[PDB]
Amino acid sequence: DRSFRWKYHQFRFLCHSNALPSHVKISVSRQTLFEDSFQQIMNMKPYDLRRRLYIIMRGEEGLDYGGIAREWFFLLSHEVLNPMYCLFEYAGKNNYCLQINPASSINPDHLTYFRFIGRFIAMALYHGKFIDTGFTLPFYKRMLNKRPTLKDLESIDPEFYNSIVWIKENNLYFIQDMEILGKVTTHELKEGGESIRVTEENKEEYIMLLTDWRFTRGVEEQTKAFLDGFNEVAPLEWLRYFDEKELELMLCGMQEIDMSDWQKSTIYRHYTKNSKQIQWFWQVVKEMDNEKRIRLLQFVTGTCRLPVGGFAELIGSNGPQKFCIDKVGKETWLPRSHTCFNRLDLPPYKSYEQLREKLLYAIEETE
């Protein structure tokens, strides 16, 4: 049970202890970037991708192979999302909740394209460089073989989350119809699922099955193919010690956070800017290392990534939704977040050295 700090050099050592000498050349034109890099890497052997990376990007003055590489990661991480590849989509407006497009099958060769990205992420992490694709946190849980919780459902599909909340909070068969490009199929949630009816005792089991299905619907093989290519280069077992939020910070890297811009673009409900709690809140957020501030930002928004322009342009489901605090819950409770709303529920805590504790615990030991 060590710190994120320890987990990096023990993981970063784990990469180096398998790094190969020499180098590997990658000749690409920024026009044919995708189709070059794809045909490049997929025709290559996996572990050659641990050698020094030389990215020959045809028509160059560049010689700082560090800059072209880091540049290449940024540019390719964006370009894989190109909708003419039919690979990804977003559940909400304004590019919210990046998820696999279940119609990738339209490309009979798509599974390889996903395998490729697995190889690519592994390269990006094995060579300790950063990207800007903007994956969901549940994505990382699947990479960690963690099951995603109901809180995750709140983040990605509010109406679907708020549906099941009703079922658990009141009192069907084990199937789920799914329209795949017109044609619809009835997925048996279990064996004989079409015949078995929902009971109060079966609901406990039943609710889980949906929670898992919502994530693993029509993306079961795209995921299985993706994970194979990543495993082919770097074992997922290497990430056994990490969690969802630690992992995202590895792939995107840490930034300094504009502490001013945060306070200047934070909106409140029930609370006001000159409340005891908030004037304490920014007290705690100041005597804080950058490591936690992102972890906090991760806790509330569901992503360490900042979109263009700062906290002002912060997006949730249903459109822009700036950083928001609310006087919610009992002060015998922890403060909890609503990442679809980019909203923090903060109880009226009667002491500074109580808020400080209660806050950090929510960030540390909850999601």
């Binding site: 990096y8 970063r12 180096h16 300790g128």
Partner: peptide, 16 residues
């Protein structure tokens, strides 16, 4: 060797 650990630590010190 152990120079690997003596380079992993430097990778964390730098990156984070």
């Amino acid at each position: 060797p152990a120079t690997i650990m003596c380079r992993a630590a430097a990778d964390t010190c730098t990156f984070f």
